[PDB]
Amino acid sequence: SAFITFEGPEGSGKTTVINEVYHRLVKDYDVIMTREPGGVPTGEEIRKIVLEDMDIRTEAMLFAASRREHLVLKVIPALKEGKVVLCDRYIDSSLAYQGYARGIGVEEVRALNEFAINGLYPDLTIYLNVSAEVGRERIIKNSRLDQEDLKFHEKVIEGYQEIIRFKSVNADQPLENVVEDTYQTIIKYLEK
Template sequence: MSAFITFEGPEGSGKTTVIQQVAQKLESEYNIVMTREPGGVKTGEQIRELLLEGDGMDERTEALLFAASRREHLVGKVIPSLNEGKIVLCDRYIDSSLAYQGYARGIGLAEVKSINEFAIDGLYPDITIYLDVSVDIGRKRILKNQRVQNRLDQESVNFHEKVVEGYKKIIHNESERFIVIDADRSIEEVVSAAYESISKYLEKL
């Protein structure tokens, strides 16, 4: 049995922490592979460094680099893992490009979806966990955790509000794939809700 499950959300939604703790809970029952985008494989990690630490990048270049990293990640890690019957948990995927570059950057949802559909060649997630957090709470968490802020973290509040708007539009259009979880709550509550949702899905397979 294999499944491709992605985690999405704006900055400060707690995705990385949630996916790590959910993976730990699932490992006793399933063969789990945890990965991330951009990154996951050597070339993808090199592109990640350019994307998150570079300066003055053209918006379309940014979108194309995310798509290129995604393709390398799929071919090098996700597809082989699925073929081996594993459950792949991925921190970000195509929906991030649609929300960040397509909507918040203003390139266009259709345009960014087109280049990413070329990259993923039909491989959409089975389900997507969306961690729904307000921009205000997300920003406060980033500052409180004192994590190193990447180029996207440093964007304006208006940009991050547009990211959330973009996600809402995507979820509205593809509601059957998404499981929306209130991430304004404590990390323990969010992890529990995500774990229960994924467990129910996997039990049906």
Template sequence: MNKGIFITFEGPDGSGKTTVSTGVYKKLQANGIDAIYTREPGGIEIAEEIRKIILDPKNTAMDAKTEALLYAASRRQHLVEKVKPALDAGKVVICDRFVDSSLAYQGCGRHLGIDAVWAINNFAIEGFMPTKTIYLDLSAEEGLKRIENREFKDRLDQETIQFHLDVQAGYKEIVERFKERMVIVDASLSVEQVIENATKKVLEIIHDQG
């Protein structure tokens, strides 16, 4: 049986990760590709419970290292319970966020350091990384404009502009550090165009891995 393909979607808040990744997943299904869609933090029951704790706006007392450890714990359970079994079954796994988010948000946004957060997460994922990562490139300022009118803002949405600028800077460093894995898609275009462009890239990845 062919090994599956693990494709993650990353980008700053407001870049459209969820909309674009679900849009791509639907197009893969329409093309008859055996794919599943999932997200982080979450994707399975235990990880969804951890997600509620992390993103609850009431949890303002949460320490940065606690936050990083919770993300890593959620990631571990999601990986062993959902992602790896799907890949072992030969499926294409489309995932909204993975380890790069922790490196950007906790490593740079929380100033814990990329290497320190990588160490925590490497323990959780045991070096298991995506086949490729679609990076939705958008400025922090534009991303914040997009999320400004959201009815519900989670704990991270409510952070300062400096936090989001630090996350953006972190992503730039991560994209450079893992450039062989990263596939850049311009997220400033219309959502339909971004989905179209991202789908084209994902189909190329699937073809190249076939």
């Protein structure tokens, strides 16, 4: 089994990467791709409460609760089946977004997440490392960004910077290269 998470700011081509890597790994591996809450009912119920000016800490705890449901009801049973699990975003996202970019403190958010994952850290974490400039362009094309969004975007990147199982891939290259690098990085882990 292998628990593989994918991390990165918006504009890192994370969606394309996970989907294309998934499609290539599926040939030889019992692999599944998921993203919290990933269909888990309670997880969905929890998320929805947020979706419906809620305190940022309240939000953080709900996302944490949702994360654990997805972990206990979907990821673990999968890892026990001996499957490779590709997860779009995990504890690191919360650290960079809630802890760093939003101001709660990487400190407290990490303790929260450790409470949620109960020692189950990713076997491998791909960090799609994209510069703010290239990231910004991908974000726009996938729609000029507000001065505030640009700033927050930059803070998320710095957050991940500080944070970095980690295997960084250059997400400033064309997505075809970002896909090849991520795939090789992964096949390398699954073969050793």
